[PDB]
Design a protein around this ligand. Sequence first.
Ligand SMILES: CC[C@H]1OC(=O)[C@H](C)[C@@H](O[C@H]2C[C@@](C)(OC)[C@@H](O)[C@H](C)O2)[C@H](C)[C@@H](O[C@@H]2O[C@H](C)C[C@H](N(C)C)[C@H]2O)[C@](C)(OC)C[C@@H](C)C(=O)[C@H](C)[C@@H](O)[C@]1(C)O
Lengths: 112, 121, 213, 37, 53, 116
Amino acid sequence: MNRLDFVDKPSLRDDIPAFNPGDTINVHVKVIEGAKERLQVFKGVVIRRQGGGIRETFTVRKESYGVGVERTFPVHSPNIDHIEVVTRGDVRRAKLYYLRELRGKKAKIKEK
Amino acid sequence: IQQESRLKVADNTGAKEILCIRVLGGSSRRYAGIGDVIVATVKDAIPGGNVKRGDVVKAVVVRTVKERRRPDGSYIKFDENAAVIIKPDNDPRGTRIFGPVGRELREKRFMKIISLAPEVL
Amino acid sequence: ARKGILGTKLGMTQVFDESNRVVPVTVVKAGPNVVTRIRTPERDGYSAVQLAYGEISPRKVNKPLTGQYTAAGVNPRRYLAELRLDDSDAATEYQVGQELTAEIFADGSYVDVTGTSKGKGFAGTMKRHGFRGQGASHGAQAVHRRPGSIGGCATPARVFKGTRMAGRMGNDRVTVLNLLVHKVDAENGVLLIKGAVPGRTGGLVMVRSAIKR
Amino acid sequence: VKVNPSVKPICDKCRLIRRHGRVMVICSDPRHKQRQG
Amino acid sequence: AVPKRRKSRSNTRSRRSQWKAAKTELVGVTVAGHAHKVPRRLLKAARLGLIDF
Amino acid sequence: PKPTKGPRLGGSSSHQKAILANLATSLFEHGRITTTEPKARALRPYAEKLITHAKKGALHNRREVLKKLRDKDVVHTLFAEIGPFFADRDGGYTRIIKIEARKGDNAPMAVIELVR
RNA sequence: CAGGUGGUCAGGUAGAGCAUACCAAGGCGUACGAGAUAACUAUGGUUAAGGAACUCGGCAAAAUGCCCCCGUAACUUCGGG
RNA sequence: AAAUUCCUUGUCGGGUAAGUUCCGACCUGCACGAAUGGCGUAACGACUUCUCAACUGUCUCAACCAUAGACUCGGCGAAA
RNA sequence: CUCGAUGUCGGCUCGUCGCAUCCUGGGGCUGGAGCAGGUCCCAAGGGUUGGGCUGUUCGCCCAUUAAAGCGGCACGCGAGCUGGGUUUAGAACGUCGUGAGACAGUUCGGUCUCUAUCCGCCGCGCGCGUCAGAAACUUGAGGAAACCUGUCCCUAGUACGAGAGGACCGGGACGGACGAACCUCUGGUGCACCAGUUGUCCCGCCAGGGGCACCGCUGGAUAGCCACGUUCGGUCAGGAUAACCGCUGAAAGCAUCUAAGCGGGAAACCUUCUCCAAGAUCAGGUUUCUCACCCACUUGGUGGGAUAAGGCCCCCCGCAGAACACGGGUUCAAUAGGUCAGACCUGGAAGCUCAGUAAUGGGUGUAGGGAACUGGUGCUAACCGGCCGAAAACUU
Ligand SMILES: CC[C@H]1OC(=O)[C@H](C)[C@@H](O[C@H]2C[C@@](C)(OC)[C@@H](O)[C@H](C)O2)[C@H](C)[C@@H](O[C@@H]2O[C@H](C)C[C@H](N(C)C)[C@H]2O)[C@](C)(OC)C[C@@H](C)C(=O)[C@H](C)[C@@H](O)[C@]1(C)O
């Protein structure tokens, strides 16, 4: 990719935490809803990290009001300035596409 | 999300089901997004309340399971489809709505649902 | 003049723009490797320019081609394409032995990029023409995906010319217009192009400035 | 114009002129302005 | 469908003649014995030995 | 080995697995093995990877070679002689040669050999 | 010749079974082959969102599937269902 | 208004978003009617007709995959 | 005409043409205030949806919509499909006939055959031609494709109007449907990937695996292909025009758009654009390369042979492909393979160790496995090759 690798090399993001699926994280995103700026702290669990470099995206799954939301952010995306990780976790899968309980009992991935 | 698609009415008017009769907005348009008026019959409401069954009434979609791309580069996938009935004036027929709403509604501008949503986006 | 240049494409990426959007962008190495051999509108009535681009060894090219590179005074290049210019020659815009680079396209200047497609094979009338081919269940004996009919019975007792039929599609030179260049890397060659360039990754692509502004 | 292919004058001001193939009339008041064929 | 008519021997013969057979031979190949003209495809097993004849 | 496009060898992919493991068993038995050229084209990468494990030489390499060649003993020979025999070659363990096409199907035959 | 042809014996393991899956005795690889990512056809597979909108018609597929345990309507000829 | 009705999509209600089909009632029954059985009739039905949920590539709108063919090569080698 | 067979309706698929235009374009009149509306003229380039009832065209209706054309082509289209309807044989009703049977009366059930020879069309090649032989770029005669449209904001609540209402013309935004291209993102798939896993068998046994059960099944899944994805397109602009409008202006001292003249004028025509294209036999052009080259005749021409430049055939390949073609490569090589380091996929190897009654869990340890994507590296295969290829008869 060396020269396409260079096409994206000055287009990276830095110091962002290490996080794999399972980690509950807390994405402070830039959204301009109403005023001249706003930050929405989308908290949830990373149920996916489809990688690639800059092309790498995670999918934070929140459970909002008896209804979930699967919000697929790109890493390195400039509408993100704080991917706070709340809680880590070493889970079995790499894509956590089973999170369809919403009864909560098994909606929580056990700690690590 | 098209004609013959039951999607749960999330507002305080009793309806839990609407089969989209039409997708209002274009000739031979098919798929209604997060925030585009659909027609909808009423498959299932409370008997006696605000609305009955079988009513050809508009509605606005606030939840589609299919990911909507925002022109930033991120997506918004929801768990279950949802449409708040509306009036022809920039007002929802209902007064509150249950659950988040796709922010893709500040643009189509019924900015009274984005007002009365429990959480926008 | 219509400022154009050759180049090959290195693949797609996405780059984030000023307004915090996404630019699903194609990288085209139009790098500073395009030299010329003018075509007078008097000797041969074009007013076009002969842009070369490529890196091959002498051993790799045959005698006629290397002779044309020597008579132009340049070391051979794998490709050698041509670009029309105008109703005018103007005798100062170019020169035989000139050098180009992707730098002319000035970060916003819309280009229209042309090149041969990816061969979609010997593709039948649904990968080729978009036929809502006949049904799949209700008794349709064998004619799923199959054309259907070709015209009527006795007056056109013949199939009209240009009837949409199965055949080898792909590879035909296509021109995708109005591709707003997002960035230009004259410091390692490439040119970003907000859009979808036609062709195999690593293939010839002529990046012409637009005509529609 | 009212185009009927049998053209007559309406009032005492229509002029059955001929004008480049079609035979039109003019009463200088476009109430009819009719024209033939 | 069936042949509506039989073929004029012109057409018949004209594409019985497009029923050719290919060719290649690489003459003068010294191997054990007198130089055999094995094809350019096989001449490595001609040299090494892994060829009958 | 990248996969093959087009119809897999023998019958389906399962018979292709079995074919490849059999051809590699007898390759690491005799060294010189004749097949039809497409079988050898499919087997050259596959066998060269196995021999890469051979010249690695550890219980994990033995256990990842026994996941192709069932035979304990041809693999004993693999991780005994054929393995160390390639103490030098980094890649390039086998060698295809062209035989004359099998009478009866005109199948282009090829002999694949461990380099020595 | 992919059909049909009476009766006999019929093991293991899982299983209720002589079904089914894998195997023993015993058989066999049964008779054109090598390839090859064309369309298209057949046989199977899976599919985002929606769920009959397809259609003459839910045709076809899908789902349900089993063991145990509760529970089980109308109507009934009082057995049922 | 029926396996029975021509006019005919008779009329009115239920169902539908919209119901020439279905259900109930009406009743000028062209042309019902009592062992050529009349009206019913629980269970039964690879019967016909309709509605409803599960469900699904049926469909919106198709895509990809594997084998048997097709295609290529060697062998024999038809037919209407 | 066809009876030694011209397969009938409706639907589907695919079209295609006409204008008698539903919309979009330009207009005239209007009993046209504005919105509009109604009628006539020109205009075929695009477009002209989804459903409910019906075998149904026919319709009626629901929700739209810019609009939801009317026709032709064997009421287009069954060697392209479905077979619901018609008009086979079974069966029942009502009615007719003594009766067998009957009913453009009804109601259930009721086999849709063919490996494509010629034309046609869609793609691909081989041979020759193109007055020496090539090679690269191309000119562009002639073609084809393509041509849709809505809302909103200012203008401006302006004009027009008692007022509800309410502009034209112009500038900008947001879309719908259609098409093309690409695979970055989303998403689909994934028969040589990873892990989990149920039955059974095997590898002597345990551990660790593996064979088969739709790939056994289940969770993923890079490449590739693709759409549900992204991006791009539709145009602006010129010429001649139709309807219509107009100037100058007679005959026919006027009046006229017409006779001479000139101007406006549209999604329709040629242009503009995208694509093919010199087999455009009218077979083009710019440039570059090779040019004694030996035998025999009837000196010569004429055959032969040899080669030049070039190309092919072999071989290694390809995200190029049915074959062929096309493109890349051939030792001065990174073309395939292998090997190494990557990007990614999976998800935490085996062994050893420690905890645990054990199931199993922690450590070694982003482990380990691995396919396509990237870059290295001369180890394997591109192999001391075969072929086919010029020399012009000459004139003002
Ligand atoms: C094993 C294969 C069989 O395939 C079929 O069943 C076909 C589908 C038939 O269509 C059947 C089945 C049918 C249901 O579908 C087509 C039906 O509609 C039709 C009446 O006969 C035929 C093709 C009929 O042709 C058609 O028959 C009509 C009388 C005239 C038609 N055309 C006007 C000249 C003509 O094409 C045919 C005469 O048999 C009678 C053919 C005759 C040789 C036979 O009877 C053969 C024994 C047939 O069994 C067969 C072909 O071998």
